[PDB]
Paper text:
Although 4 molecules were seen in the asymmetric unit, PcpR appears to exist as dimers in solution as illustrated by multi-angle light scattering (MALS) consistent with weak interaction between the two dimers in the crystal lattice. To further analyze the biological relevance of the oligomeric state of PcpR observed in the crystal lattice, the apo-form coordinates were uploaded to the Protein Interfaces, Surfaces, and Assemblies server (PISA). The results of PISA analysis gave average buried surface area of 1985.3 Å2 and ΔG of dimer formation to be −10.1 kcal/mol. Thus, the observed tetrameric nature in the asymmetric unit is likely due to crystal packing forces. Despite the close proximity of the PCP-binding sites in PcpR, there were no significant conformational changes of the backbone, or the dimer orientations upon comparing the apo-form to either the PCP or 2,4,6-TCP complex structures.
In general, the LysR family transcription factors consist of an N-terminal DNA-binding domain (DBD) and a C-terminal inducer-binding domain (IBD). The PcpR dimer was established by interactions between β-strands and α-helices from each monomer.
Residue numbers in the entry:
A (entry chain A): 89 to 302
B (entry chain B): 90 to 302
């Protein structure tokens, strides 16, 4: 059914834009070394029921936190992620510290995710509860968009640390801890039972599961 | 409608590139004159944009959408060209990017077909001229693909503003693309139903006043 060295299969992985940008580069080596005509497509999250897409075969694997996925779904946990805060290094509060109430008074960009039933909705909910409505300036579905915007303007962004670190590395942004206690996230890969024994699917899970996510 | 005291959440539909470009150019106007106004960036979807503009679901669309015509007003904001980027630590760098070398590289392609975005044209041209095995990754977000090109040895063909944005802050280097590609017109789009809506009108005018480099 599936041979890495000769396959032309195009694998589709559903993930947030962040999850995509995290995953695919970690697959490149394996692809050039052992599967040089295999393709990986990063598919955005949708409003429709994700379990259906895994069932129909239109998605091979989902990657991230999808608490709503259960029946007929098999999973494996890959790592934990924690949230932090960022603001750009030419931000007025940077010269200052930031306790909880100064935090509440700044401008925020929120990444929204409840429509996609992605675990980040947990954080989103916490922030919408905490923050004065007037404190929220921008809203977007994409983590990477939100990061770029935080670099170009004075808004505070609350995001997975891995993403924060990737953008900190260019010095646009400073990382500081969230002044509230946010849930720790379990990031996994998800697939459907109907494909548990599919050779290609099995191969992909193996590769993903061997990724050094440290 | 008063900007100074409104709390309206305006929804703009654009590619992730379009959102990243637009919203920052709106911050000052918000800070100075509409401090309670929210802007939301919405991803392009499966369905037809017109039905979203009509619905009120989306206030304005930003980008290049040839398909919007019947009941849509537009104002052209600027025009964009395409280039290639590869990271400085790429073998093909110190060698030139002629068409024959191009074909021998691995590519990441941004796909746009689903949401009738002008990039369809660019995507189609590349697929025409590239062997199916030089294509390694595919994604629908420009920003995703730009960080992937920064992390791995893939070639990425993208709009120059996006390119210039990543070249400055990192390892990607910009190359002309040895493939014939259309120029692009970036417009704002809105339904005629809201042509006269004060809120909309205000937004459209703030945008038409942005100085896109």
């Amino acid at each position: 059914r599936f041979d890495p060295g000769t396959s032309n299969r195009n694998f589709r992985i559903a993930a947030s834009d962040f999850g995509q940008a995290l995953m695919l580069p970690r697959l490149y080596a394996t692809l050039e070394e052992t599967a040089p005509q295999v393709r990986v497509t990063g598919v955005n999250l949708r409003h429709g029921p994700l379990v259906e897409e895994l069932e129909s075969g239109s998605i091979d694997i989902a990657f991230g936190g999808f608490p709503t996925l259960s029946a007929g779904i098999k999973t494996q946990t890959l790592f934990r992620e924690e949230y932090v805060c960022v603001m750009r290094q030419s931000h007025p509060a940077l010269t200052h510290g930031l306790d909880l109430e100064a935090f509440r008074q700044c401008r925020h960009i929120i990444v929204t995710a409840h429509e996609f039933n992605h675990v980040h909705e947990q954080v989103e909910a916490r922030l919408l509860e905490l923050l004065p409505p007037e404190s929220i300036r921008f809203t977007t579905e994409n983590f990477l968009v939100s990061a770029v915007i935080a670099e170009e303007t004075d808004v505070i962004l609350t995001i997975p640390s891995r993403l924060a670190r990737w953008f900190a590395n260019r010095g646009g942004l400073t990382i500081f801890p969230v002044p509230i206690e946010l849930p720790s996230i379990e990031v996994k890969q998800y697939w459907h039972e109907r494909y548990d024994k599919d050779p290609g699917n099995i191969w992909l899970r193996r590769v993903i599961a061997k990724i050094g996510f440290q």
